[PDB]
Symmetry: D2
Subunit: 223 residues, 4 copies
C-alpha cells in the first residue's frame, strides 16, 4: 500500500493549551508491520511549555500497529493516501482537549507526514499537568470498533498518566478514525494494546524529547 | 472603560466540526449596559454547513450583560484592552467542542472585535446536530464563580437545544474568562440569565443568520 | 390537597456509603406554601458516620417550595397521595450516589412522611467527604423540566459543597420526580432557587444535626 | 483457600430500577481456576421485569477468573471468608446504577454465596433498556489496579450492550474490590478479559434466564 518495513516520518503540531500557543515539529523512524516507532520533537514556538508534554504525546498514527493476518488493517489499507482522525481527551479534573490529525504517505520519500491541531483547556493551575508532575502514560488496551454504514472506526481507551509521587491521573480518549477513500473491507471490533514512553532531551537551546510507542492488534481472548 | 451605551461589533470565526472546515464573519450592534446584542453572520468558507448552526451560537461576549451596581462587572472592567475565554461543550450524545475567543475594544471605532476558533467532533451522523434538527437554545441560568488568587472567573451552565419535534438535547458548558490585565476588584459568585435566539436569513445563494442575546446578572434570590 | 400552612414531617433513611451501612431517623416542622423547612436528624445505626453528613442532605421534598400562582405546582398537586423521586449525584472526583425517596401526606396527623434509600461509593479516602472537610452546600438554581407525555419532571442542578479551607467541591444532581397519580396539569419549565444549611447538634450519646432549606420557584427572568 | 476445581454457587439479589422493586434468586456451577461459570436466575418478586435483564448481569464474582501463576490473585487469596465489591454503572443516555455484593465461601457445602443489592434510575422510557431492545454485552477488557496502602483494587471497564437492530449502547463500569481480611500480597496492575452471554429460559410460572461467563487475567502484552 505504498508502505515499507522501515520508514521515516515528519510531524507538525500547532496548538493552544490553557491559552498558551505553541508549535512543535519533529521526525522519526518506524516499522509499520512491527507496530514500532521512535520520534523526536522540538518546540519551535512557545517554549518552554508551561504544561506537561505528556498531554501531547498521543496527538502526534495507527499505521504503526502490528496487525495479525486475520484482522483487517483499516489503517494500512488507507495508504498511501492516508487518513484523518479526531480525538477528545476528557481528564478526571475537568480538563478537556481535542486533537485532529491528517496523515499522508509520501511514496517518493518513503516518509509519512503528520499534521496536527491540538487544543485544550481547564487544566487546574495546581493540577499535575500545569505543575509538570507527570512521568509517562501507563500501557493500555484500546477497543476499536467499526461503524459499518459509515466506513469509519471508533476507538475507546481509558488512560492513566503516572505522576512523580507515584499516583495516577485518568483521561478518557474517544477517537474517530476515517480513511481518505471509502474502504473495501472493514475489520470486526478488536483491541489494540499500546505502550508509549517519553524521554526528555531538552538542553540550553531547545525543549525537546523523544517518544517511543509499540502497538499490537488482538482479537478478544475468549473463544 | 472605553464603552458606550450603543456600540458595534465585528466577528471572525474559523473552525472545524466533524472534519468539516469553515470560516464565518459577522457584524452587529449591542447595548453593553442593557445586556443586549443583535448580530448577523455570514458563512464565507465551507457553506452550506453540514451541521446545525446552533452549536456555534455561543462561540461568537459577557461585556453585554446587565450588571447591578453592587456586583463587580469583571468584563466591563477588563475594557478597553478586553479579555479572553475558553469553553468546553460536552453534548449528551458524546460530542465534544472547544472554543477560544479573543475580545478587544477599538475605542477609535466604538467597535468590539471578536476573534474565535471553534473545534468539535463526534457528533453522531444520525443525531440532531448533523441532521440539522435543532431550533433554538432554551433560556438559561449560568453560575459565575471567582477563582481565588488567579484573578479569573469560571462559568458553569447546563444548556438545552430544542429540537424540531419538541425534544431537548443537552450540552454542559464550562468556561474560563480571563481579563488581559490583572483585575483590582473581583466579583463574588453570582448568576447570569441568558436568552439566545436564532433567525435564519439564507438565500438560495448564501447561508446567513441573525442571533440576538439578552443577558442579566443576579445575586442569589434567597436573602 | 391535605396540606396546611404549618406541618410536621418524619424521616427514615437507610443507606450505604463506601460500604458503611447506616440508618437515620428525623423529624421537622415546615411551611409548604412559604418554601421553608427545619428538620432534625439522628443517626440510629452506623454512627458516628465516617463521611461528611453534607452528602445526605438532599436525600431527606419539593412540596416545600414557594410557587407563584402562575406556575403549576406539580408537587402540591400530587398531595395527599404524594410522589416519589430518584436522583443521581455525580461528584467531580468520581464518587457516585443514588437516592430514592417515597413521600406521602398523612392528613390525620398533618404530617409528611419521607422514606429514603441512599447508596454511594468511590469517595476517595483522602477526599473532602471521607476526611469530613465540608461545611455547607452553596445556594443554587435548579432547572425543572416537564417530560412530554410521561407525567413526570426532570431536575438538573450543578451543586457545590463548600470546603473548610474555602474551596469548592462540585456535584451534578439529576432528578426524576414522579407524582403517584396522573396529574391533570403539567408545569412549563422553570427554576427553583435553593438555600440549604447544616448545623451540628451532636451530643455525648448520638450524632445529630439540623437542616434548614428555603426554596422558591421562578420563571426565566428574561420572560 | 477453601476452593475446589468445581463448585456450586447461590445468589440473592434485591433491587429497584426506575422505581420498580424486585427479588431474584439463583444457582449455578463454576470452575474457579478455568474462570467459567453457568448460573440460572429466577425472578421471585416483581416479575416480569419491565426493564432489560441484561443490566443486572454483572451484579450477580472475580473468584471465577483464570489467573497466570505470576500474578497475585487477590480474589482467591480472599477465600474462604471472601470479599465485597461496589460498582457504578454510567450509561451513555444518563441512567445510573450502583450495585453492592457480598461474597462468601461455605467450605462445608463447597458453595459460593453472593448477596447483591442493585439500584438504578433515569433509564429513558423510550430507551433500549425500558423497551427491552438489548441482546448481550459485548466481550470486554477490564483494567484492574491496586490501591497503594489501602489493600483494595479498582476495576475500570467500558462496556457495550448490543441491541436488536445491531446498534450498541455504552456503559462505563467502575468497581472497588475489597477482601474481608487485609491482604498480605497485592497484584500489580493487570487486565481481565470477559465474555458474558444470556439465554432466556422463561416459562408461564416465572421469568428465568441463564448466564455464562468466561474471564481470563493477562499482563500487558507489551515488553
Amino acid at each position: 500500500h505504498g508502505l515499507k518495513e522501515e520508514m521515516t516520518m515528519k510531524y507538525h503540531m500547532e496548538g493552544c493549551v490553557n491559552g498558551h500557543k505553541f508549535v512543535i515539529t519533529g521526525e522519526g523512524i518506524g516499522y509499520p508491520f512491527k507496530g514500532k516507532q521512535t520520534i523526536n520533537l522540538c518546540v519551535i514556538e512557545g517554549g518552554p511549555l508551561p504544561f506537561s508534554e505528556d498531554i501531547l504525546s498521543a496527538g502526534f498514527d495507527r499505521i504503526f500497529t502490528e496487525y495479525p493476518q486475520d484482522i483487517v488493517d483499516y489503517f494500512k489499507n488507507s495508504c498511501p493516501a492516508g487518513y484523518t482522525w479526531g480525538r477528545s481527551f476528557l481528564f478526571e479534573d475537568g480538563a478537556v482537549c481535542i486533537c485532529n490529525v491528517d496523515i499522508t504517505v509520501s511514496v517518493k520519500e518513503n516518509c509519512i507526514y503528520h499534521k496536527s491541531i491540538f487544543n485544550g483547556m481547564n487544566f487546574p493551575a495546581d493540577g499535575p499537568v500545569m505543575k509538570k508532575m507527570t512521568t509517562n502514560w501507563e500501557a493500555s488496551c484500546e477497543k476499536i470498533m467499526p461503524v459499518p454504514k459509515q466506513g469509519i472506526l471508533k476507538g475507546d481507551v481509558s488512560m492513566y498518566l503516572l505522576l512523580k509521587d507515584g499516583g495516577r491521573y485518568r483521561c478518557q480518549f474517544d477517537t474517530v478514525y476515517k480513511a481518505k477513500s471509502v474502504p473495501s473491507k472493514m475489520p470486526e471490533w478488536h483491541f489494540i494494546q499500546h505502550k508509549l514512553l517519553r524521554e526528555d532531551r531538552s538542553d540550553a537551546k531547545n525543549q525537546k524529547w523523544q517518544l517511543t510507542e509499540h502497538a499490537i492488534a488482538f482479537p478478544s481472548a475468549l473463544a
